């Protein structure tokens, strides 16, 4: 993480026979690697792009190339439902244990 | 376990859901898949040398 020059690394990545690339890193690291890939024609056709939640947004979202297919969790922020379900499960566990 | 995810297709810097992962399968939506290089047809990444 936080490397300043991995252009050659993406070069041997393109040296590989396959044309499928997948990423898992931090927001800033993803932004840097997206900049490197865009400046080295690594975002071209054929190179399908699948990435994780940590890099479909944040700093990398600006330099995100076209055609990115991202994933996310539905209602991953609505805390009221989360805490209600947690209260339900913990109360059920406490009741069943003390019984 | 069995978390149901959703997949987003970057349609001109926009958030569009093109499928839901039901925990065992990814059922896609009607929207086409926008691929890198501005393509809507599926590229297969196994090109020979």
């Amino acid at each position, epitope marked *: 993480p936080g490397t300043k020059n991995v252009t050659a690394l993406l070069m041997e990545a393109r040296e590989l026979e396959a044309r499928v690339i997948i990423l898992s890193a931090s*927001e800033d690291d993803a932004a840097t690697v997206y900049r490197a890939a*865009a400046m080295l024609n690594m975002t071209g056709s054929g190179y399908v792009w699948l990435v994780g939640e940590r890099e479909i947004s*944040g700093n990398a*979202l600006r330099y995100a190339p076209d055609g990115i297919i991202g994933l996310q969790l539905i209602n991953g922020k*609505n805390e009221s439902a989360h805490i209600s379900d947690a209260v339900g499960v913990v109360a059920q566990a406490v009741h069943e244990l003390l019984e | 376990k069995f978390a149901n995810y959703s997949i987003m297709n970057l349609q001109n*810097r926009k958030l569009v859901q093109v499928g839901i992962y039901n925990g065992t399968h990814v059922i896609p939506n009607d929207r086409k898949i926008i691929w890198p290089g501005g393509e809507t047809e599926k590229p297969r990444g196994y090109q020979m040398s």
Partner: antibody
Amino acid sequence: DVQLQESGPGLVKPSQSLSLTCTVTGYSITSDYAWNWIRQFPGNKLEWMGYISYSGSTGYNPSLKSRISITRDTSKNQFFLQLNSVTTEDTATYYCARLYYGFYGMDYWGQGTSVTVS
Amino acid sequence: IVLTQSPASLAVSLGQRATISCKASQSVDYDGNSYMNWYQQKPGQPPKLLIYAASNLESGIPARFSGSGSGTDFTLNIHPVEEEDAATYYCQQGNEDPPTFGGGTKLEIK
């Protein structure tokens, strides 16, 4: 629907720090995003000061970072712009706008508040 | 490194195309994408984003507004034109720092 409101002291006795308040009701505050401060002069021209996300990323002008403070209030998660000195003559309008990341999509805009530098 | 809009007070009539030239000194086009935004304003009125990317439809307004060009030059094309379009229109880049104001040309009606 999602609503936002901007307010501030505007003008009190001189040699003080403006704390312009921006908040959003009807929507989550700290999921993703860009939050930009915008300054406009009655000469009909715009310019940029700074952006803050929920990602924690911040970005400001190198020449304007001297007396700008972006502070948190947690009870509703509203953000405050602290800047020194308020007057009347240098009447300019200020906006707080949440927007799609990358300075790309200006989803929302501010209503404008009277801030002066003189 | 100046960014301009042409012209400040242009002749705008009804039915034809209106050409606003957003000249940005920098090379906007990044990885095949030119980050343009066009928005309207009135003095003291909250701005509202009219069109984004110059080629993607904005929800609420038909194809009367569009944007062409590349790199150094861009063009807001109003085809056709209506009467209430009289406002301070601003073109804004979105590639990277610096976020630079456009000409903010005001649309006058003949």
